[PDB]
Design a protein around this ligand. Structure first.
Ligand SMILES: CCCCCCCCCCCCCCCCCC(=O)OC[C@H](COP(=O)(O)OCCN)OC(=O)CCCCCCCCCCCCCCCCC
Ligand code: SF4
Ligand code: SF4
Ligand code: SF4
Ligand SMILES: [Zn+2]
Lengths: 145, 48, 387, 89, 176, 95, 114, 95, 112, 208, 123
């Protein structure tokens, strides 16, 4: 799940808080997820494009540390506080759960640094009343990590 | 070309249609005038 | 604690150039104003060092764009003065003519835009129609609308097209009627007056220390002029008279600009009567290019053409400071010439760069709503101030 | 002429605007640097700040020319055909 | 000489101050003078319909940069580099390789209409009057690309109208 | 009717034609590649060879005050055509 | 060799004044990074501040030192106030400067005599 | 102007006398265009036998003299006599 | 008598004569307190005595302004004030002592 | 020499020579070189100390007034042991005359607060600081005029190239205007326009 | 004044970026363009910089660079001023020595001399 400024994922979670309060966590837990920030991805593509021996080799990207549970939802909802789509296509989409298979060149095998969620999450989120930096109490799920 | 009744709005044009077998009326703008009418329409010279 | 910090605004609908401003104030009253200038700064003086005299001249056109033929006259007079040349008489006369015409421009602009800023949507329209007639003159003269040079060192080139002075006469005929129409549009208006009466006065000696030169010194005591005292060309001869005012009140400065428009009509008239049919450029082939008929068919004319464009005429070394009367007040360029083609270091003097530095004291006694009029009243262009 | 010092403010003025919007670059300066294009403080073109639609050259562009630029902008507005591609056909 | 204004004696004597209480109080000057001099409305405004009408201009007006050629067109440009040499914006480019005939023309002759300030210097400097500022102002390109001119675009600009430019030059060459 | 590349590009009076490899050619996709359809050189051979019964002659190149500056060209050698350096239109001395 | 020193005769008072300046910055880093709503952690910003001091650490002449201090109190005098937008304060950081290879055969591998 | 009746009486009655040169400048007095073609004079020099460029050059002078350069009470003279004060103008003393 | 002077920020004092007398006598005292060689005391004392005598002659206001060659009388008074201030300021920092160090001696040649 | 040449007057020449000479007599401390341009503009050279005393004088003394400061500027000249000429250019209100005051400094040596005489010097001095970097002792304020806030390097001085070391642009990454090392689309073609032969014989210097 | 006598080499960090380390500066007296004969181009020391790469712009092909210092030139009266400004201004330099025409003896009569090998054919 790719994460950034205008993206469709975490922004969606920020906007799903509205009436009825039933985005997900119907059965709870069961969801492990590791969003990755965008510039890391696009730098992945540009190194892949200008670096030889990136051809004919399939691989994936990984959120370096976070690897969060649904505690994400209440986190990104906690920080930034509080103010046509689709069906189980979409909610089952976002409810899909896996990090899948370890052995595939992850990131550094393409030679680029990884970004933890926090700071960029602040950047994209903004909102709230903006007047107090405070702390925001990082989620730090890292279940079983 | 007016009778000379007044300046500045001396003379005026209708572009009509079909120029270059392209576009249509309602597209009127500059450059629809050919070069010599560009000269005599702008007060450059008083001789058509 | 109290006070505030407020800021500028990006444009009024007519805005010529943008400043920021920081005014530390009291309740609807400004105790301290600190204009931030340098917002639009294009770095001309560094460019001029890289381009020959004939090339750098449009810079002296467009550093102050509103008044233009005047700035032209400044730089040209500088190169002539330092270069030991005199332009032929007819060149001087034409230069005077368009000088005072340009002064009519910058004054009518300053007044009208000073109205539009304050209120009064219409006079801008009535008079800038006539201004459009003025540019209708320039387009015949120089072959372009506004920035076209039509001024060189060693005299102007490309004399008037046949039949121009008739049009000049015709405009100058009834311009008096129309400016008087403006004088009924204003001047006994309780609104405009009662808005600007005592706002932003100045003491004469104070203006001298702050270096104001222009309608400032005119309208406030301290009778002075460069036109009268240091005549820089045949502009000496023609008769006219400068206004003054005793209230130093910023209303006097207005009326002085007006009366300078009227006197400008006198000077234009007498100029149309006195025009000698001598010639355009000087006759020295190495200062100014030959006309094409001599260029072709004659060798030395060709050479001086070719080199005078490629390399350009060489100016002997010296340091000069020339000053003229430009509609914003005293304008001048300080030329520094290595013996060479190019110049070296030339710093223009912007009257707005002085007058603007005075808002600190001038605006000290009136709240911001009239700080508007305080800025707008002294003729200023933030394109000229920065440089 | 768009100086380095003004540029950010310019993009802010662009940046609080009705979403449908268009930029008309007037004058030789803003349209790619004009009579300066050099030294430092001046930005070269207004593309480097905001995207642009109608470039009208001239120094200054004659009011007629500027007006012709606005009209041509209108004739860019004609062919927008913006909605029927929201119909996706 | 000094002729100064606003230095006057306002009369506090009677028959002046009558009209001063009338003046402050009844707005006669304001009303009569202003409202009437706007009621000056009826004069036919000055406005021109630009598509269908065009303002005045002059034979020396400066448009866009058409190259010219002789009768039996020779590419009147000799390549002599002057127009590039006096360009105050420096925006021109000339590279000249002697062609098949042995005469010299330009390979790449370019202009940035962006950079171009529309001096007129390149119109004065050309010994043969190869390049002349056009009469036509025809512009408003949709891309910063399109304002850069090849030798080719300048030629085709010259072919699009000449007898135009021939009329202007033939008119004003006595002045230059 | 200019000589046309195997790609379809129209070469110019100074042949600029891009090579099939060059990526820059893509800039002409959907938009015309503009070239003057009338070459210069082709109009030089168009002109007749002027002849003068004098030894040394002038070319204004189209009349006074409009044209190239005067130059007197030497026709002495008749085994070649003496050419103006500006116009390019030949001269000979008749026999 | 004569001179007209500015605010300090010897490098002693120089070191004094630069200590003062660094105190000021270390005061006002949080207030600014919170003030223009930057995304940087106060720790990071402070680290860049002390870095920018360390870059010039090799200077000797206290005229030069004092002049640099004038530069510092000048720029800090602009950041303490709002006169400088989010842009420039970020412009100290280089995000959009592409990383420049400093290792030889990478430089040789590309730059052809930088 | 255009034919105007009773409205031009309104305008004559508001702002005073008018109709000389309607503000719009649209009535004749346009000079035609260059009935004669221009022919221009040429000033001093441009003549054989009078002159050598040395006399009329006018450049190549002015090495600035230096005074007091380190290398009878007199009058305490000023730069010049002061400005004789201006006088009023007999046309309008005031306005 | 007269009326508000043309200059905007300058007062009108009905007693020009002995005012000038006072001021000039002051300039004689203080200006005479300088060591007497330096040209400043010489010339300034000269012109001061002269113009003083001009005050000693014509009683009337206007013709005094005329023959005095200064500006309007108020301007003259002010300039005498500034004269005094410059005088005592000139007693400080001793302008007449010999040159401070000469320039680099290669500096002032312009053409390079 | 009658046509085409500016007629020169010896009246103003002799007068201004007399006046400059006078200034030299009365101020032996600070005065170095007093010269008259052959087009008649008096120009005085002053050691970089007495700027305050010399200008306090030239504003007063009643045999000279110079109530108005015309313009304050400087010229950056390498090759000299002192890079810069601070040029004070004054306007005499009473006498119809202008004279120039030249002073010098290197980069480090300040010039001290000309404000206390002429208020008009207020911004000219700041503009000099920003665009050159001549420091001014105890100026009431020092800020940036004509350049960007974060900008650096004092542009007008010849050490600083025509273009800058930075540019501005915008990119959707950071949502802010950024800076990158200057990159020109066109090289800024350079010209050598200086021809040999010494067009002017007078100003020549002795070869060594 | 308390002049505060101080001795150290003058260096400047108040000036531009890291170009100072990499680029070497050149000092010379430009030799006369041979295709003309005259010396006024000479007589003044100059400072120019090591040049850098330039490429053909894909849209047009004007030369282009990041070499802000490419086009500078600084005229000096004497070499001591060149090394002075180089030292002071902080970047390394390299000096070239000035050269002059060697004094010669031309005697017109030597064209026509009797036994001497020098004789002018055609004159
Ligand atoms: C015999 C028995 C007894 C009879 C007794 C009868 C006595 C009658 C005596 C006169 C009666 C009153 C006449 C009207 C008075 C109205 C108020 C007034 O006088 O306002 C004037 C006032 C002056 O302004 P200012 O000088 O700044 O203030 C002085 C403060 N020290 O303010 C102004 O001048 C400024 C106001 C400007 C307003 C904006 C411009 C308006 C323009 C249009 C106005 C006309 C509209 C006419 C109506 C339209 C149709 C309804
Ligand atoms: S008129 Fe010319 S110089 Fe002025 S802003 Fe427009 S393009 Fe630039
Ligand atoms: S008009 Fe344009 S091309 Fe011609 S010299 Fe000026 S800037 Fe250059
Ligand atoms: S000046 Fe004329 S002939 Fe010479 S290179 Fe330019 S366009 Fe060609
Ligand atoms: Zn020919």
């Amino acid at each position: 799940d790719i994460f950034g400024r205008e993206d469709r994922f975490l922004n969606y979670f920020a906007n799903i808080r509205w009436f009825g309060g039933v985005p997900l966590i119907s059965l709870g837990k069961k969801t492990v997820k590791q969003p990755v920030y965008i510039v890391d991805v696009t730098k992945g593509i540009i190194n892949a494009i200008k670096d030889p021996d990136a051809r004919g080799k399939t691989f994936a990207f990984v959120g370096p540390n976070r690897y969060l549970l649904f505690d994400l939802v209440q986190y990104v909802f906690a920080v930034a506080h509080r103010p046509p789509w689709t069906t189980r296509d979409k909610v089952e989409r976002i409810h899909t759960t896996d990090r899948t298979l370890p052995h595939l060149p992850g990131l550094e095998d393409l030679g680029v640094q990884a970004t933890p969620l926090e700071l960029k999450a602040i950047e994209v989120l903004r909102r709230h009343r903006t007047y107090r930096w405070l702390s925001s109490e990082i989620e730090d799920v890292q279940p079983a990590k | 070309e007016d009778n000379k009744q007044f300046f500045g709005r001396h003379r005026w044009v209708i572009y009509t249609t079909e120029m270059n077998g392209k576009n249509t009326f309602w597209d009127v703008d500059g450059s629809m005038v050919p070069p010599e009418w560009h000269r005599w329409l702008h007060c450059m010279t008083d001789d058509p | 604690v109290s006070n505030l910090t407020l800021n500028f605004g990006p444009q009024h609908p007519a805005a010529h150039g943008v400043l920021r401003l920081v005014m530390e104030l009291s309740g609807e009253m400004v105790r301290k104003c600190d204009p931030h200038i340098g917002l639009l700064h294009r770095g001309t003086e560094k460019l001029i060092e890289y381009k020959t005299y004939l090339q750098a001249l449009p810079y002296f056109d467009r550093l102050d764009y509103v008044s233009m033929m005047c700035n032209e006259q400044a730089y040209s007079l500088a190169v002539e003065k330092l270069l030991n040349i005199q332009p032929p008489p007819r060149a001087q006369w034409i230069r005077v003519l368009f000088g005072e015409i340009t002064r009519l421009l910058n004054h009518i602009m300053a007044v009208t835009t000073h109205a539009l800023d304050i209120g009064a949507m219409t006079p801008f329209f009535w008079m800038f129609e006539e201004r459009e007639k003025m540019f209708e003159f320039y387009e015949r003269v120089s072959g372009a609308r506004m920035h076209a040079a039509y001024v060189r060192p060693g005299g102007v080139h490309q004399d008037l097209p046949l039949g121009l002075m008739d049009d000049i006469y015709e405009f100058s005929k009834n311009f008096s009627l129309r400016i008087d129409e403006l004088e009924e549009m204003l001047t006994n208006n309780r609104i405009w007056r009662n808005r600007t009466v005592d706002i932003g006065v100045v003491t004469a000696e104070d203006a001298l220390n702050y270096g104001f030169s222009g309608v400032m010194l005119r309208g406030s005591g301290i009778q002075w002029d460069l036109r009268k005292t240091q005549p820089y060309d045949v502009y000496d001869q023609v008769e006219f008279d400068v206004p003054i005012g005793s209230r130093g009140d910023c209303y006097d400065r207005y009326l002085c600009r007006v009366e300078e428009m009227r006197q400008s009509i006198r000077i234009i008239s007498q100029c149309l009567n006195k025009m000698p049919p001598g010639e355009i450029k000087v006759d020295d082939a190495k200062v100014s290019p030959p006309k094409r008929a001599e260029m072709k068919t004659s060798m030395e004319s060709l050479i001086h053409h070719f080199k005078l464009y490629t390399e350009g005429y060489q100016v002997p070394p010296g340091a000069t400071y020339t000053a003229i009367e430009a509609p914003k007040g005293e304008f001048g360029v300080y030329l520094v010439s290595d013996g060479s083609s190019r110049p070296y270091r030339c710093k223009i003097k912007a009257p707005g760069f002085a007058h603007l530095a005075g808002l600190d004291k001038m605006s000290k006694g009136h709240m911001l709503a009239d700080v508007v009029a305080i800025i707008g009243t002294q003729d200023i262009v933030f394109g000229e101030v920065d440089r | 002429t768009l100086t380095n010092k003004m540029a950010p403010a310019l993009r802010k003025v662009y940046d609080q605007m009705p979403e449908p919007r268009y930029v008309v670059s007037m004058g030789s300066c803003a349209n790619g640097g004009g009579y300066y294009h050099y030294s430092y403080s001046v930005v070269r073109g207004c593309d480097r700040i905001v995207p642009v639609d109608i470039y009208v050259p001239g120094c200054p562009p004659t009011a007629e020319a500027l007006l012709y630029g606005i009209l041509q902008l209108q004739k860019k507005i004609k062919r927008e055909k913006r909605l029927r591609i929201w119909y996706r056909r | 000489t000094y002729k100064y204004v606003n230095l006057r004696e306002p009369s506090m004597d009677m028959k002046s101050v009558t009209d001063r209480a009338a003046q402050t109080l009844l707005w006669t000057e304001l009303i009569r003078g202003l409202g009437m001099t706007l009621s000056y409305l009826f004069r036919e405004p000055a406005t021109i319909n630009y598509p269908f009408e065009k303002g005045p201009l002059s034979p020396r007006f400066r448009g866009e940069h058409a190259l010219r050629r002789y009768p039996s067109g020779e590419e009147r440009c000799i390549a002599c580099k002057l127009c590039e040499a006096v360009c105050p914006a420096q925006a021109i480019t000339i590279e000249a390789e002697p062609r098949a005939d042995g005469s010299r023309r330009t390979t790449r002759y370019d202009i940035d209409m962006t950079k171009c300030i529309y001096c007129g210097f390149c119109q004065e400097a050309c010994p043969v009057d190869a390049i002349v500022e056009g009469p036509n102002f025809e512009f408003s390109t949709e891309t910063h690309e399109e304002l850069l001119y090849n030798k080719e675009k300048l030629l085709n600009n010259g072919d699009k109208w000449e007898a135009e430019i021939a009329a202007n030059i033939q008119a004003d060459y006595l002045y230059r | 009717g200019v000589r046309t590349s195997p790609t379809g590009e129209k070469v110019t009076h100074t042949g600029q034609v891009y090579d099939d490899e060059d990526y820059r050619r893509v800039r002409f996709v959907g938009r015309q590649k503009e070239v003057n359809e009338n070459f210069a050189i082709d109009l030089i051979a168009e002109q007749p060879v002027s002849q003068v019964g004098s030894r040394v002659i002038s070319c204004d190149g189209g009349g006074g005050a409009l044209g190239h500056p005067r130059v007197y060209i030497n026709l002495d050698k008749e085994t070649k055509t003496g050419t103006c350096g500006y116009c390019g239109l030949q001269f000979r001395q008749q026999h | 060799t004569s001179v007209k020193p500015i605010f300090s005769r010897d490098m002693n008072e120089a070191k004094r004044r630069v200590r003062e300046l660094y105190r000021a910055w270390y005061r006002e880093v949080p207030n600014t990074v919170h003030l223009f709503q930057l995304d940087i952690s106060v720790k990071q910003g402070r680290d860049k501040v002390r870095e920018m001091f360390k870059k010039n650490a090799h200077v000797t002449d206290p005229r030069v030192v004092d002049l640099l201090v004038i530069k510092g109190k000048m720029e800090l005098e602009e950041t303490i106030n709002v006169w400088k937008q989010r842009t420039h304060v970020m412009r100290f950081f280089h995000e959009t400067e592409a990383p420049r290879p400093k290792d030889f055969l990478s430089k040789f591998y590309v730059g052809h005599d930088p | 102007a255009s034919a105007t009746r009773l409205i031009q009486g309104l305008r004559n009655w508001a702002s005073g006398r008018d109709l000389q040169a309607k503000l719009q400048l649209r009535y004749q007095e346009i000079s035609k265009r260059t009935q004669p073609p221009p022919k221009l004079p040429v000033g001093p020099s441009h003549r054989l036998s009078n002159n050598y460029y040395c006399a009329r050059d006018g450049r190549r002078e002015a090495m600035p003299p230096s005074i007091v350069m380190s290398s009878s009470e007199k009058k305490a003279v000023s730069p010049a006599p002061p400005i004789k004060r201006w006088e009023l103008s007999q046309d309008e003393p005031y306005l | 008598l007269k009326k508000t002077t043309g200059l905007v920020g300058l007062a009108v004092c009905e007693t020009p004569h002995e005012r000038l007398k006072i001021l000039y006598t002051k300039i004689l005292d203080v200006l005479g307190h300088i060591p007497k060689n330096a040209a400043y005391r010489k010339y300034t004392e000269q012109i001061t005595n002269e113009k003083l005598s001009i005050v000693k002659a014509e009683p009337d206001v206007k013709k005094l302004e005329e023959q005095l060659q200064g500006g309007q009388i108020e301007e003259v008074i002010l300039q005498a004030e500034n004269e005094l201030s410059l005088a005592r300021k000139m007693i400080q920092w001793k302008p007449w002592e010999p040159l401070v160090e000469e320039p680099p001696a290669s500096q002032w040649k312009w053409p390079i | 020499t009658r046509p085409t040449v500016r007629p020169r007057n010896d009246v103003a020449h002799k007068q201004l020579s007399a006046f400059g000479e006078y200034v030299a007599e009365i101020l032996p401390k600070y005065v170095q070189q007093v010269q008259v341009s052959c087009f008649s503009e008096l120009e005085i050279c002053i050691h970089p100390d007495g700027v305050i005393p010399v200008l306090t004088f030239l504003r007063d003394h009643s045999n000279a007034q110079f109530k108005s400061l015309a313009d304050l500027t400087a010229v950056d000249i390498p090759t000299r042991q002192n890079r810069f000429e601070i040029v004070y250019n004054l306007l005499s209100l009473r006498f119809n005359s202008r004279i120039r005051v030249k002073t010098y400094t290197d980069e480090l040596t300040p010039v001290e607060s000309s404000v206390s005489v002429y208020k008009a010097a207020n911004w000219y001095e700041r503009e000099i600081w920003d665009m050159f970097g001549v420091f001014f002792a105890n100026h009431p304020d020092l800020r940036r005029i004509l350049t960007d806030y974060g900008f650096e390097g004092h542009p007008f001085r010849k050490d600083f190239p025509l273009s800058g070391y930075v540019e501005l642009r915008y990119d959707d990454e950071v949502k802010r205007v950024v800076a990158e090392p200057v990159e020109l689309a066109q090289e800024f073609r350079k010209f050598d326009l200086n021809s040999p032969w010494e067009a002017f014989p007078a100003y020549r210097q002795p070869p060594e | 004044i308390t002049v505060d006598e101080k001795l150290d080499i003058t260096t400047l960090t108040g000036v531009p970026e890291e170009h100072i380390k990499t680029r070497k500066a050149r000092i010379f007296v430009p030799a006369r363009n041979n295709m003309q004969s005259g010396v006024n181009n000479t007589k003044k020391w100059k400072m120019e910089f090591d040049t850098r790469e330039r490429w053909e712009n894909p849209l047009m092909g004007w030369a282009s660079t990041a070499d802000p210092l490419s086009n500078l030139v600084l005229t000096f009266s004497t070499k001591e001023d060149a090394i002075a400004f180089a030292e002071k201004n902080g970047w390394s330099y390299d000096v070239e020595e000035r050269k002059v025409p060697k004094p010669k003896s031309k005697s017109y009569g030597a064209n026509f001399s009797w036994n001497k090998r020098t004789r002018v054919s055609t004159k």
